[PDB]
Design an enzyme around this catalytic site. Structure first.
Site, PDB file in Angstrom:
ATOM      1  N   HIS B 268      36.837  28.415  49.416  1.00 13.75           N
ATOM      2  CA  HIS B 268      36.769  29.817  49.833  1.00 13.75           C
ATOM      3  C   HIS B 268      36.043  30.687  49.146  1.00 13.75           C
ATOM      4  CE1 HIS B 268      39.439  29.767  46.550  1.00 13.75           C
ATOM      5  NE2 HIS B 268      39.501  31.113  46.743  1.00 13.75           N
ATOM      6  N   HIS B 314      34.168  28.694  45.761  1.00 17.44           N
ATOM      7  CA  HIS B 314      34.735  27.925  44.747  1.00 17.44           C
ATOM      8  C   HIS B 314      36.022  27.170  45.405  1.00 17.44           C
ATOM      9  CE1 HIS B 314      36.131  31.972  44.725  1.00 17.44           C
ATOM     10  NE2 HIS B 314      37.254  31.636  44.417  1.00 17.44           N
ATOM     11  N   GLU B 328      45.183  34.564  40.392  1.00 18.25           N
ATOM     12  CA  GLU B 328      44.031  35.244  40.679  1.00 18.25           C
ATOM     13  C   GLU B 328      44.128  36.726  40.663  1.00 18.25           C
ATOM     14  OE1 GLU B 328      44.070  33.312  44.608  1.00 18.25           O
ATOM     15  OE2 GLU B 328      42.783  31.738  44.211  1.00 18.25           O
TER      16      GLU B 328
HETATM   17 MN   LIG Z   1      39.650  32.101  44.432  1.00 14.18          MN
END
Ligand SMILES: [Mn+2]
Ligand SMILES: [Mn+2]
Ligand SMILES: [Mn+2]
Ligand SMILES: [Mn+2]
Ligand SMILES: [Mn+2]
Ligand SMILES: [Mn+2]
Ligand SMILES: [Mn+2]
Ligand SMILES: [Mn+2]
Ligand SMILES: [Mn+2]
Ligand SMILES: [Mn+2]
EC number: 4.1.1.2
Lengths: 377, 377, 377, 377, 377
Positions: B268, B314, B328
């Site tokens: 993504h 990534h 994240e």
């Molecule tokens: Mn990510």
């Protein structure tokens, strides 16, 4: 055992998942001296924490300003070549200084009057290639592994100007025209860079020496550092190579420092410029004194890069049971240091006493001779 | 065993002194995928490689732009408090987002209409303190260890504005005048900051709640992240907290990601902004795709910081036998991602086929539903 | 009386609350020449407008780029020491140039080969300490008050590297090890910087002179400026000290200028670099000609800093009834100026006439000899 | 004939070798209005002066900040696709706005909730792709040639993130794992980017429309600009598309301007932001009024980029015998202008008269209605 | 005919309005070599694309960093003077180097010891005025047209410091005082700059020579470049003037290059610094090799500026039927180049062979003598 960040009645056990192996490598970071204080930039980075470019014939991995942002003026590459393997003929903006840790290799360099220099470089040997001049490395029978330093921290190992890559991006008709040949006579040029490639071992150095209409180059580009007489002090040795003895090395001054178990590189600073360090072998700790009562202690071992911003105070203490061996690099035309001991030895005793709130018993111990490496009593 | 940087007929054994323990932690850096290419900035740093400030009551160690220069917009602190221990009432320019990894703690915050909020925060809980608003942390009976993130990468843990330090640097007559007291009534003010200090455990949360003429604050400053329903996919879970559900959290969007052994966070990118990552537990590898055929693979484990510049492609693959658990972080008011799978699933099959040189057998496998974490078959 | 910003039929009386005392000090700013025009940066700042650090033994107050942003390359400190009082042994990145206005003082400096220099400095005397070399100041029986200039405008007086502060932030075991002493032999080291401290007057200079294995330093670090022969012109004197006569002073070229009542420093510019000015005594006005028909006039008196960006035209006119005495500082290895008068004197008369729309009656008055200071007829 | 830079009694014939064809294209630069004055940055660049990337299926050439340094916030690409030819599925940090000059094309875009939009775009049509969202272009039966604008002037056409390039730089095992397929099922993936490639014409738009679990996108990404009602004035038309009517177009406001022979875009400025211009067809001249009595006149024709820094005054005068057709681009969420005529029309006549030293005969001609394009009488 | 951007099966016809005359001047940009690749900054700009300042007596038009942003260190002015016309006495921060293309002119310069130099300069002649020193230009009977280069790319032709402008912005009383005259004796001074003005032709050079108390200047400020012996190769000539032969020219090294039809400036790079180019006459193409497999080809003709960033590889090929004549400018104290041919000639043949995948038949053609300009066979 399992180290904890506790110092007397300060700190606590770690309670989240952690990296114990790194904690063990950083005793003075997990548990700093109580004399450390304030924010200081990171001055420590490991080549083990970098991506390794693998090619047929060896590898190269780099530590730059993108990894260690404090070091804006100096970057380094750890390169490895298998026997006979070639680092492609190339050039760059940056000047290149190098230390040969393992093995031996042959270098070529042609200068801007078209004078060539070709020479074999052994362990403990240096080379220096002035900005913009084209060069090569080919390892001999043992292979070679060496540290390169470049006088710009923005350096990128991937962006060197290479012979084949240049020709691969030049119109075939121009190449033909430049050389006075036909396009067909050159149809076999490589379509992409080589960078590093396996090649047969060369012959004896003397059969390579290229005679030319233009003369011998005025100063050699290599240096036998370990064949020089070192400064010997009680706990170690220091070999200095800068523009005053290694004459071509205008933009890089260097020292190899050996520190015996239980010895330390004394408290000093550099009055001229920043220090960039590479730790060849052994285990060390260093404290950087940043003024305004700021100071921070770092740990280093083989494969680590260290740095000391211009004029900050420091020492480098061996904290292992093997010799500590590291390089001191400066972007300057000379090596200079000011020693805390020598400095105070050269002033009136009662003056120094006024400063430190100590007596004759202290100032009596000062030495007017400089001893870069001292042994613990 | 002893890993070597060799991949098939590329690379060579290391021949200089080296850091074997780090090499073992970085298999994909010592020996990168053959698909990696070109210079990419460092996207990996360990809290173990930072100086730890030890105080009576705990510790704090930071990863900033001075350590990881790529991350200009976000910095982080790993902080630890012993039972009852206090993080001094203070404030800063930066907004503060936090995840409670171990323990529980009480926070206070007073806003700019003088409305207070006081609340207890457990494991899996968040807080967010808007820029400039003053706050405190006091750990309860288990102590507390937590990750703080600040929406400026220049942040410095040592430079927060603290209650005692402010008063210690204000003329005593002004303080007396500000409060309507005598200089003698205040002669016992601390002469220097406290920062972190041991203190007795507080009482029940309800006895602390402070009534005021100004009202309840309109939105809570804490969030029970792990009490939300997560996105469940085949190999893991994702809990999202951003300004649309955690309402005060305007400048920081977050996700907790759990990835089972043999699963990965899918391929993504983030179409809105840079990703800052913290690895809570487990072992991972990630490849950052930087466009222009540049890509580089990094390894991470507990205590590591990672980063992915705005829009780069990534994935994050668990490469250990324990669950991989990471955060994240985004400096934005929403979380957004574009999934490679979903993206292609939503285009005409023959179009995708034209692109990839593959057939129905491939496009048949595409899923129009988004599955942030996939399991290996 | 009460000055108003009125010039003929331009301007108006001030109608809001105002600072009359400053208006009186700035007649040419409240009421500029009609020949002034356009935006020009501020070139004027008073040490009276700075915070004064008071210590036991004196004080120090600074004018930096944070105060006068135009001056990016040069900063200054006005320092004061009571009799015997010591400026702590210290060092900095910046080179230090100094003028002794009041009193006398002793300086020490040790260079990087461990050669010491110790000398007494009187009124009208200079010193220069090259970057990074450690030094001290101790005032004699009259005390001392002097102007320091540093070759970086970012300089901060609070951030010098000091002997005691360094040791206070170095682990006691390292200090003990560095010197070959026990931790107990050094338990009395100060815990914080001293900076400036009262101390007994020293003895005669000759009893301080420290003999050493390393030699006399090759060039003195002090200079008797007022003992040199000055350039005498009709209305004043100019003493020049730069790297060609004050040999160590590589990065700073200086001039002391005395301008009699009714005289002015002539119209000139500096073809090499920016001018930084300090006004020791008297009252002046200067116009900076910035090209593109931009010009602006500033007023100065004792304690003022002035500045003239590289190559801009100017003059300095005494506008009081006492001598005007100011310093011209340049970050360069030489002093250079181009005089408007001499320049035109050295060209063909009819050429100059073509330029200025004036006749023989004007070009006849030109002088091919340079007279830095002229008297009004 | 041969133009000379002579205006009345100013200027001279060119005497060195010269570029006559360019001189002829720049009459107002070789011979500027006498009202021009002072240094103004370059505001003019031709796509003909750029390298053209040629691929199988078309070409792309760019004008960026590297070509036109004034335009730091906006860059542009002139792209061309042959019939059926594909611009590879890709993404970028920058938002993309586009005008279709020649032909027709199909676009795809998938948003961050996995909702797809697919639509055909004709001459006079726009699209806007928000930052980070992936998209494609495929030309229909006539081919397509169009102008792209990106909301960062640092944009580089070569550095877009492309589907194939991403997969070519991702480990094959990760790709297999991401999709639930075998490495062999994907062995045919391209090894390098495609960028632009010949492909068969697609079918009717309706057979491409992809149904999805996620909904129709809330706002279309394309716009029929020339189907809107334009502002009609005496000598031309203006079509405005910004975030208030073209709803997705948040970061780019646009206008298409048609100016008849003998007409001009009136004297105005933009009170919100810089103007970036592209000259589709015709020949123009414009004067940029930069304040402080600075102004400079530029000439433009088909394929030229122009620029007007934030708030500077200007007009655009058709100076040829064909219609002048150009685009006005702004990095903002709205279009705004202030007209000199309307501005003065809306103030008291005697006030305007006081300003301009003119009478009723002038202020009588002012119009309170805004007419962006006026005809010469 | 009508050129199209088509190369074999790549590219397409242009379909939007276009600038055919520019396309014709840029064959290698509209249709680049297939060996070009990647983003490279613009290295090409025409003086025809600049505003021309017209004065009574000539004109001046400039190419700066505002036009060609790559060239941060060097800017240029194309200036023209009618017979007798004067460039006003003036000065600037920047050093000035000049080449006299057409005509002849007299220069004056006074240095900082008040020593004057006055000399006549013909076609093929140079001058160099060190930073800050005042100077003039007056054209003789043929007029003059010449290229000026300044060692800062930020240079602005409008912002020079001029005699009249300085006096127009200095208080009349100060001027009177500076010179010892009355305000009335100077009431006729110009009220604004002159810059360039018509003036009667001067007399013979010898009647202008001004005797002075200060001596002859130690080194001349002019140079007869075309009277030197050039390096002759097969297809052209090269005249070098730098600080080693033109002694005052410390900051600018130059070469005039003549390339015969069917010849080219060979493949080389500059190991010291960036190259700035001006194309005096003829038509050329050049490819800049930027490393990392980046390269881009530019076209040039009379009136064009070119640039080659430090160390990038290039050649300059005449592509017209007239001689190509261009200048190579460097901000450095020497000229240096490394020739691809000479470089390879000076290495072992089997080594070069290993690199290029070619045999004796190729390495046999290498020349150890440097031939800057080669002819096609
Ligand atoms: Mn990510
Ligand atoms: Mn190299
Ligand atoms: Mn050191
Ligand atoms: Mn906080
Ligand atoms: Mn000092
Ligand atoms: Mn001056
Ligand atoms: Mn796009
Ligand atoms: Mn406009
Ligand atoms: Mn000039
Ligand atoms: Mn060249």
């Amino acid at each position: 055992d399992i180290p904890q960040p506790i110092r007397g009645d300060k700190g606590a056990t770690v309670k989240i998942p952690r990296n114990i192996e790194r904690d063990r490598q950083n005793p003075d970071m997990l548990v700093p001296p109580e004399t450390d204080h304030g924010t200081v930039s990171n001055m420590k980075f490991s080549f083990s924490d970098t991506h390794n470019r693998l090619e047929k014939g060896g590898y190269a991995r780099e530590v730059t300003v993108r990894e260690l942002p404090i070091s804006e003026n100096l970057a380094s590459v750890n390169m490895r070549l298998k026997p006979g393997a070639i680092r492609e003929l190339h050039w760059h903006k940056e000047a290149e200084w190098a230390y040969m840790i393992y093995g031996s290799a042959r270098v070529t360099i042609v200068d801007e009057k078209g004078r060539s220099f070709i020479d074999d470089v052994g362990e403990g040997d240096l080379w220096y290639f002035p900005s913009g001049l084209p060069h090569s490395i080919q390892a001999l029978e043992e292979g070679a592994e060496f540290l390169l330093v470049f006088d710009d921290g923005s350096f990128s190992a991937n962006s060197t100007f290479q012979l084949t890559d240049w020709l691969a991006h030049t119109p075939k008709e121009v190449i033909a025209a430049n050389f006075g040949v036909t396009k067909e006579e050159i149809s076999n040029l490589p379509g992409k860079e080589k960078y590093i490639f396996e090649n047969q071992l060369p012959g004896s150095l003397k059969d390579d020496i290229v005679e030319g209409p233009n003369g011998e180059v005025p100063y050699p580009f290599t240096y036998r550092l370990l064949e020089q007489e070192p400064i010997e002090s009680e706990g170690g040795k220091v070999y200095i190579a800068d523009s005053t003895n290694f004459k071509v090395s205008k933009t890089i001054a260097s020292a190899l420092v050996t520190v015996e178990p239980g010895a330390m590189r004394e408290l000093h600073w550099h009055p001229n410029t920043h220090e960039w360090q590479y730790y060849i072998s052994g285990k060390a700790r260093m404290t950087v004194f940043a003024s305004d009562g700021h100071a921070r202690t770092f740990n280093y071992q083989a494969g680590d890069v260290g740095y000391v911003p211009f004029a900050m105070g420091h020492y480098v203490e061996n904290i292992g049971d093997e010799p500590l061996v590291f390089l001191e690099i400066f972007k300057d035309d000379h090596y200079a240091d000011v020693s805390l001991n020598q400095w105070l030895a050269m002033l009136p005793e009662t003056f120094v006493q006024a400063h430190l709130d100590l007596g004759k018993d202290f100032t009596d111990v000062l030495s007017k001779e400089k001893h870069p490496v001292v042994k613990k009593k």
